[PDB]
Design a protein around this ligand. Structure first.
Ligand SMILES: *[C@@H]1O[C@H](CO)[C@@H](O[C@@H]2O[C@H](CO)[C@@H](O[C@@H]3O[C@H](CO[C@H]4O[C@H](CO)[C@@H](O)[C@H](O)[C@@H]4O)[C@@H](O)[C@H](O[C@H]4O[C@H](CO)[C@@H](O)[C@H](O)[C@@H]4O)[C@@H]3O)[C@H](O)[C@H]2NC(C)=O)[C@H](O)[C@H]1NC(C)=O
Ligand SMILES: *[C@@H]1O[C@H](CO)[C@@H](O[C@@H]2O[C@H](CO)[C@@H](O[C@@H]3O[C@H](CO[C@H]4O[C@H](CO)[C@@H](O)[C@H](O)[C@@H]4O)[C@@H](O)[C@H](O[C@H]4O[C@H](CO)[C@@H](O)[C@H](O)[C@@H]4O)[C@@H]3O)[C@H](O)[C@H]2NC(C)=O)[C@H](O)[C@H]1NC(C)=O
Ligand SMILES: *[C@@H]1O[C@H](CO)[C@@H](O[C@@H]2O[C@H](CO)[C@@H](O[C@@H]3O[C@H](CO[C@H]4O[C@H](CO)[C@@H](O)[C@H](O)[C@@H]4O)[C@@H](O)[C@H](O[C@H]4O[C@H](CO)[C@@H](O)[C@H](O)[C@@H]4O)[C@@H]3O)[C@H](O)[C@H]2NC(C)=O)[C@H](O)[C@H]1NC(C)=O
Ligand SMILES: CC(=O)N[C@@H]1[C@@H](O[C@@H]2O[C@@H](C)[C@@H](O)[C@@H](O)[C@@H]2O)[C@H](O[C@@H]2O[C@H](CO)[C@H](O)[C@H](O[C@]3(C(=O)O)C[C@H](O)[C@@H](NC(C)=O)[C@H]([C@H](O)[C@H](O)CO)O3)[C@H]2O)[C@@H](CO)O[C@H]1O
Ligand SMILES: CC(=O)N[C@@H]1[C@@H](O[C@@H]2O[C@@H](C)[C@@H](O)[C@@H](O)[C@@H]2O)[C@H](O[C@@H]2O[C@H](CO)[C@H](O)[C@H](O[C@]3(C(=O)O)C[C@H](O)[C@@H](NC(C)=O)[C@H]([C@H](O)[C@H](O)CO)O3)[C@H]2O)[C@@H](CO)O[C@H]1O
Ligand SMILES: CC(=O)N[C@@H]1[C@@H](O[C@@H]2O[C@H](C)[C@@H](O)[C@@H](O)[C@@H]2O)[C@H](O[C@@H]2O[C@H](CO)[C@H](O)[C@H](O[C@]3(C(=O)O)C[C@H](O)[C@@H](NC(C)=O)[C@H]([C@H](O)[C@H](O)CO)O3)[C@H]2O)[C@@H](CO)O[C@H]1O
Ligand SMILES: *[C@@H]1O[C@H](CO)[C@@H](O[C@@H]2O[C@H](CO)[C@@H](O[C@@H]3O[C@H](CO)[C@@H](O)[C@H](O)[C@@H]3O)[C@H](O)[C@H]2NC(C)=O)[C@H](O)[C@H]1NC(C)=O
Ligand SMILES: *[C@@H]1O[C@H](CO[C@H]2O[C@@H](C)[C@@H](O)[C@@H](O)[C@@H]2O)[C@@H](O[C@@H]2O[C@H](CO)[C@@H](O)[C@H](O)[C@H]2NC(C)=O)[C@H](O)[C@H]1NC(C)=O
Ligand SMILES: *[C@@H]1O[C@H](CO[C@H]2O[C@@H](C)[C@@H](O)[C@@H](O)[C@@H]2O)[C@@H](O[C@@H]2O[C@H](CO)[C@@H](O)[C@H](O)[C@H]2NC(C)=O)[C@H](O)[C@H]1NC(C)=O
Ligand SMILES: *[C@@H]1O[C@H](CO)[C@@H](O[C@@H]2O[C@H](CO)[C@@H](O)[C@H](O)[C@H]2NC(C)=O)[C@H](O)[C@H]1NC(C)=O
Ligand SMILES: *[C@@H]1O[C@H](CO)[C@@H](O[C@@H]2O[C@H](CO)[C@@H](O)[C@H](O)[C@H]2NC(C)=O)[C@H](O)[C@H]1NC(C)=O
Ligand SMILES: *[C@@H]1O[C@H](CO[C@H]2O[C@@H](C)[C@@H](O)[C@@H](O)[C@@H]2O)[C@@H](O)[C@H](O)[C@H]1NC(C)=O
Ligand SMILES: *[C@@H]1O[C@H](CO)[C@@H](O)[C@H](O)[C@H]1NC(C)=O
Lengths: 172, 325, 325, 172, 320, 171
């Protein structure tokens, strides 16, 4: 991936996560835990959901057309009938090949991006209270119970109240 | 370096889901790459039967659309029919007078698209000629007969006078006139049927005409006959007139066909027609139209996926799959 | 922080982007609708209502068809020796001469339109034994009975209509276009009155090609007082090649050839007025601006044109995503 | 956006900023200010300026073609003329739809990237003298008059001059 | 300093880069690129992959009919037939309604395999010859056609039948002769008026002669019109005529082929290529070509552009 | 570039690096050195190498078709044959133009991404032992010989060994 999150600095995915596409795992004095992030999951799903409808017109009716199979050799008129149809088929086959390739490329890149964005959103919240361990993990340097992990998860974490403790554990 | 994590510290890891069994797709970067989920975009399986619940499907069985039109005796069940899609079977045959139609394909196309065999009879006057000529190649049951929509005219007594009739279109729609000329097998036969040595048919409107000479010669026997007829059509537009002038060999019309601008067509297939649901039809039977593309047949009718060469195209519906350990 | 009045020994620096109050919605790969700061329409769907005469050389056909103007219909005489980039045929145009048909009318119209000129040179033909300049009461020029200015009706002179046999070499360096014809009388009496012979025939031949037509005696719908008809054909003589004409009756001779160019010219059907303005694209709905890549006005276009598409609107973002305050 | 700057960590745009697409706002001892960043603005405009011209030509000159409207029912050859044209139109209509969707996608992507690039450029200059507060704002932990801001904006900021003051202010 | 280290990251560059086009940029410099359009041909048609038949001074039709200077082409087959622009007819003057269709059908079939058949023509003179069609310095005629004339003072109504008991389609080429006068007509065929009817069970064609002078071609003012008929397995050909018949001598084998015909003037020689254009063979390494829209074989797609560069390396940013 | 590494926060490319597409330059107590990074380079090449094959299929055979050049003047039926060929060429010429630009945009973006990732991977390894000097260099605040640089290169650099020296020198 171009952001280097999925199959990048995040080593592998979590099979035991069935309630969302992205999320958190944590450990503190109260134990370990797992929770999905729904905003991240939703953003990804909306972009992917019926994504072709944004470029392919709702299948429309086609009635009487030209003949495409012949039982006799006729020459000039038939050659053209055959050539026109062969041309149309080849062009649409190319469209299909390219559309799928591009759409897939887009799907990898956007889901990779969401992973990265969720990471950077968390980093920013934590400020100087945490360091990046690698592997997509944060080492938080203050007492941090389930209620506190919760405030990180829902975006209401206040770094200012833990800062003095955190800077003390980080640098002594 | 301490084995037991501190009470004054915590760990927070971010991640994404993975599934046990992934699936390969193609991107711009990779020939093959494993994703968590994916969708097939190409329809390759047909139902094997033609659903007749959405569109009106008419089975031609032993009859071509053209034969049904002209009135080939074994196609009598098709009188005044209408369809969205007419099925021509390969086993179909003709069983009347031997004929040909220059630009057969066009006439078939025209009628198929019109979507109807509505036929009004008109009272033409054929002063001084014998009407209702028939043949032993075109049996209606036990009797000699002819195409039901055509009128084979011959001499009366010892003459065949110059036929000159008119037929005005005072209706709100286009009239289709099917008529023809007869080609005898010898000069002896020509003068026997028509008196004149050189037959001649002229069919005209106000700004258009068709002029045909009969062809004379020995041909292979078809159901006992070496004679032939050639078919011709004429579209008279509202306000215009139809005129027929002939000194012999004329296979006259009996009336007209109503022409429509419809959404109908004709299709060749040997696949059975059966009760089911579908809004798209191919020679291989009805197909589902959920998927954007189809690999079944280039010949389609109705609400159809675009036909493409590829039998499979996988669209990623989830992220890259990176399994545990 | 808090502190109502901020400190002199610190500063705040924020980075950001612009926004507009009234945004506009566009479509992407990720989103059906998304707001941007600005966008441009890429589909042209308004015409100018009229045809601009200044860029390309436009020729109004008025109440003449391109084929009539070429044939030499009296009411089309103004069009003599004219050339064009685009000829405009009007829906109200009519023919005002002897009633006729041109088999493959469509092809001749297209050959002349694409050539883009009615340059006609007279030629010295020798019609030994016949009368020239046959006139009709259905083709009034001035007051007197007249004919197509570009064609020459031939009839019997004295007791006989001799076998005509005329040559005409192309010693130039361009393709010559000869327009000729054949007459169909309404009756047998009329045939022999005009051409003596029971049966007419015209054979027009070059070195590499030949054309034979047989007339067809018979009544056609009364048109401007006539039940007879004429049928128009053409022959193109290449450089070095030679024209030959042979007839024992019914010939409607040529008077000369048209010069054939490989033009960048055409003909279009339209009813809108022609007026003063500069525009490089023309459709039947009038001239359109060519600044947008796509258009939705008409599939029929001439000149520097945007491509026809089915969509009436397509917005291309010309700015970042708009996030208002 | 894949970079998650516009409609991400930057909360909203500035209607007030009229002479640029990207810029700064600052508060210090001398007051409040605003300035556009012309480099990143120009890069954005250059890439967006009639970007279709790169894949599709302005107009093509076409002359005599085929008939496309008919008054009489002729059959086979008319069928073919209609079909040929219909195919052409459908194909170009697909091309148009895909191109716009692609170009639009690319426009959003690139303009987000600029915002992100400008934020990173600033982060790197400031070194340890400043913290990212979220919202795309930096707290600069030293006296920083208009001259000093100017140095940031023209890329000549010298972190070494302020490091001691900055560091003292950050960890107290 | 000994208490520190400096680690710098970077990427390579070249002194000599190359310009490409992107969605973002008109021109941008990359480390390396590759050409996607073949714009140069070999100047010659390679005859190693496909069977290539040089028509020399003959067209495919003339070779089929059996023009004397085309007699070297008897019983030939090809993948591609090359018609030179300087080809010419040198037999009796002829025309063919739907020339293009016949030519196209034959070219596609890809063979001229001919099989003589014993047509009995009772009461007429066979092997009529002309001064327009000299073979061995004497009067001759198309090798595959049989020009029939009166015998004594009689040309009886010809009526022959020839059944297709084979597992393939038979192609018959026949024709009609148009004399230049009424004396010529009655001198050759007795009857004032001629007629040729050629039919199967599923078709019939009847052609009447047109008497009259046409332009002098190699002595002759008369003409001959060619026509064709296909007889299917189980069907039966019948020929009925009372004058002016130019009879076939047998049948050509029609087959579903992957063959074609092409117009070119370039030499043919041994070389390695799987794609053929009028301007010569071209390399199919590239996905596109600008040489010619007329191609045959495994060919790159023809496009309007003469160059498209595909980047194959990062952006090039040379040292200060 | 969208990441702004190449032609961005890395001032220029290196002509003197022949063994790779991406790599490292360093100065320590044992002088200066240069090394290439293979994983980055291979990821780039793997994506770029024969990339068109993913969209465009292996050139296929075409045999008899339609006439495309005419010596005579015929009108309607010839007009159609000309229009058909012209439409075909114009559509393919478009397909070709768009493909190359999409592909090029992609190659530029992906090569910029690899560089950005290589910078990020290093940064994460160094933790609090180093600072970003800009220009794509790291100041490393501890004694760091060739074997220590080697550990960074092969990704086995343990920051806990130097944390106290480093943090001392930084503050
Ligand atoms: C020009 O040349 C053509 C071709 O040779 C002639 O056309 C043939 O004419 C003959 C003469 O009548 C036809 O012969 C007839 O065949 C009929 C049909 O045959 C069926 O059964 C046989 C079984 O052997 C099959 O071969 C065939 O396919 C059919 O299934 C028979 O019904 C006739 O038999 C009767 O003969 C006499 C009278 O002739 C009766 O009294 C008997 O009772 C008996 O039933 C008859 O033999 C032949 O079919 C025609 N062939 C074709 C292809 O058309 C033209 O006549 C000739 N023209 C001129 C002017 O010379
Ligand atoms: C084969 O059969 C057809 C059809 O039956 C015949 O064609 C008709 O022939 C007659 C006689 O020749 C034609 O009569 C002519 O009609 C002209 C136009 O008539 C229409 O338009 C006017 C408009 O004013 C209406 O009044 C009228 O109702 C019609 O709708 C008339 O102008 C002529 O009539 C007379 O006009 C003046 C009046 O001032 C008189 O002085 C003259 O005496 C003149 O006769 C003219 O007679 C009729 O139009 C033909 N119809 C068609 C459709 O062609 C063929 O003649 C016939 N052929 C043979 C060989 O038998
Ligand atoms: C209908 O009208 C046409 C046209 O007028 C007549 O066709 C012409 O017929 C005559 C003979 O009847 C032809 O005359 C012959 O012309 C040949 C032309 O080839 C030459 O072409 C040019 C001429 O300048 C030169 O490059 C060069 O000389 C070529 O050779 C001559 O070669 C013939 O000459 C031979 O015969 C003459 C006797 O006349 C002797 O001097 C010699 O023996 C010589 O070998 C010959 O003169 C003429 O070509 C025809 N023209 C066309 C266009 O077809 C029809 O005859 C007429 N139909 C009827 C029924 O009357
Ligand atoms: C041995 C012999 O010649 N017998 C005479 C009959 O001819 C032969 O036998 C009949 C049964 C057929 O097999 C013929 O092909 C065969 O020659 C002859 O019968 C009539 O033959 C003529 C042709 O010679 C023709 O086929 C007649 O067929 C009909 C038909 O059934 O189709 C009769 C129809 O009423 C008639 N329709 C018309 C006039 O509108 C048609 C029509 O003439 C042809 O279709 C036109 O091509 O033919 C058949 O009756 C009989 C002489 O009349 O005498 C036997 O001795
Ligand atoms: C001045 C004159 O009358 N000269 C006589 C010759 O005719 C002249 O020259 C020939 C070449 C033509 O150009 C004539 O138009 C011209 O008058 C005459 O030669 C014979 O002329 C007749 C014309 O009636 C005819 O063209 C002869 O042509 C052949 C031929 O070479 O093809 C002879 C073939 O045997 C014959 N084939 C048959 C019978 O199967 C053909 C065939 O009849 C026509 O092609 C059918 O259209 O014609 C030509 O030799 C010369 C000998 O009589 O006498 C001169 O005085
Ligand atoms: C009421 C009546 O019986 N009047 C006849 C009259 O017949 C009529 O003719 C007019 C034109 C129409 O109304 C007809 O329907 C009606 O029968 C006689 O007039 C002549 O009729 C001829 C029919 O045989 C021709 O139509 C002829 O038309 C001209 C013409 O006007 O163009 C004369 C012209 O010189 C001639 N062109 C030539 C010789 O080059 C031309 C052609 O012969 C024909 O169009 C060829 O098809 O026709 C017209 O004069 C009238 C004359 O005797 O007698 C009344 O009693
Ligand atoms: C890298 O160096 C090569 C080789 O020096 C450069 O290729 C050269 O580029 C010039 C134009 O930039 C080409 O000139 C062109 O072709 C002919 C020259 O006679 C002329 O007709 C045209 O008008 C046009 O000027 C030149 O042919 C070409 N030389 C060779 C040997 O291929 C390349 O441009 C350099 N690239 C960069 C990014 O610096
Ligand atoms: C970068 O800016 C600095 C100073 O910041 C200036 O920024 C400008 C945008 C200006 O409008 C104003 O905000 C501010 O003065 C420049 O250095 C200054 O310029 C001249 C140098 O001769 C002196 O008069 C100043 O003393 C000097 N200030 C300092 C602190 O050195 C600098 O020139 C400029 N660099 C570039 C490359 O443009
Ligand atoms: C990662 O690198 C270290 C040290 O730096 C090394 O970098 C290598 C890529 C290579 O250039 C090597 O020559 C260079 O020393 C490796 O540790 C060293 O390994 C060598 C033998 O391979 C020993 O002789 C050294 O004692 C040892 N250094 C120390 C400080 O112990 C290390 O093996 C390597 N790790 C992996 C997994 O490859
Ligand atoms: C072509 O035909 C006639 C001329 O014969 C024109 O008819 C006139 O039309 C104008 C207004 O359109 C009116 O004055 C009358 O209805 C007609 N006058 C006469 C004297 O007939 C017709 O307009 C011409 N068509 C065009 C497009 O100019
Ligand atoms: C378009 O066509 C021509 C020039 O291309 C011009 O025709 C003139 O039209 C005006 C009407 O306003 C007439 O009064 C003139 O007599 C015409 N000029 C000539 C030289 O014939 C004109 O520019 C355009 N036609 C219009 C406006 O009708
Ligand atoms: C955000 O979280 C605040 C505290 O954390 C909570 O986390 C949740 C998971 C919850 O179930 C409890 O365990 C914790 O109390 C909470 O007080 C706020 O109300 C939350 N914010 C919003 C907007 O609802
Ligand atoms: C936006 O447009 C509407 C007019 O349709 C107007 O009422 C509104 O005031 C506009 N606001 C601005 C800021 O342009």
């Amino acid at each position: 991936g171009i952001f280097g999150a999925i199959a990048g600095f995040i080593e592998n995915g979590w099979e035991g996560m069935v309630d969302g596409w992205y999320g958190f795992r944590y450990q503190n004095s109260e134990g370990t835990g797992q929770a999905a992030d729904l905003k991240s999951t939703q953003t990804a799903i909306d972009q992917i959901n019926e994504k072709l409808n944004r470029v392919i017109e709702r299948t429309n009716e086609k009635f009487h057309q030209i003949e495409k199979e012949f039982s006799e050799v006729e020459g000039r008129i038939q050659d053209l009938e055959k050539y026109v149809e062969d041309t149309k088929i080849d062009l649409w086959s190319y469209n299909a090949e390219l559309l799928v390739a591009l759409e897939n490329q887009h799907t990898i890149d956007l889901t990779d991006a969401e992973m990265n964005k969720l990471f950077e959103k968390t980093r920013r919240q934590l400020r100087e209270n945490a360091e990046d361990m690698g592997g997509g993990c944060f080492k938080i340097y203050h007492k941090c119970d389930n209620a506190c992990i919760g405030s990180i998860r829902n975006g209401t974490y206040d770094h200012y109240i833990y800062r003095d403790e955190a800077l003390n554990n980080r640098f002594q | 370096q301490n084995p037991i994590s501190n009470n004054n510290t915590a760990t927070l890891c971010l991640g994404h889901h993975a599934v046990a069994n992934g699936t390969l797709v193609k991107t711009i970067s990779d020939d093959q790459i494993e994703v968590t989920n994916a969708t097939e975009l190409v329809q390759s399986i047909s139902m094997g039967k033609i659903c007749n619940n959405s569109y009106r499907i008419l089975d031609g069985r032993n009859c071509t659309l053209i034969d049904a039109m002209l009135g080939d005796p074994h196609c009598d069940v098709f009188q005044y029919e209408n369809w969205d899609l007419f099925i021509e079977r390969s086993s179909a045959f003709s069983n009347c007078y031997p004929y040909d139609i220059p630009d057969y394909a066009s006439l078939r196309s025209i009628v198929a698209s019109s979507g109807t065999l509505e036929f009004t009879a008109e009272g033409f006057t054929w002063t001084g000629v014998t009407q209702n000529g028939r043949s032993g190649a075109c049996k209606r049951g036990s009797a000699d007969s002819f195409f039901s929509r055509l009128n084979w005219l011959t001499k009366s007594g010892n003459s065949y006078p110059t036929l000159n009739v008119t037929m005005p279109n005072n209706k709100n729609f286009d009239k289709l006139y099917i008529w023809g000329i007869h080609h005898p097998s010898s000069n002896q036969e020509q003068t026997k049927l028509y008196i004149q040595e050189s037959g001649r048919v002229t069919v005209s409107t106000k700004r258009s005409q068709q002029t045909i000479i009969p062809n004379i010669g020995s041909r292979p026997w078809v159901r006992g006959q070496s004679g032939r007829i050639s078919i011709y059509w004429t579209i008279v537009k509202p306000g215009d007139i139809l005129m027929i002038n002939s000194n012999g060999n004329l296979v006259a019309p009996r009336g007209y066909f109503k022409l429509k601008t419809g959404k109908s067509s004709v299709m060749r297939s040997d696949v059975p027609i059966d009760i089911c649901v579908s809004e798209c039809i191919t020679p291989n039977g009805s197909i589902s139209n959920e998927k954007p593309f189809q690999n079944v047949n280039k010949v389609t009718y109705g609400k159809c996926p675009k036909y493409i060469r590829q039998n499979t195209l996988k669209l990623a519906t989830g992220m890259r799959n990176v399994p545990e350990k």
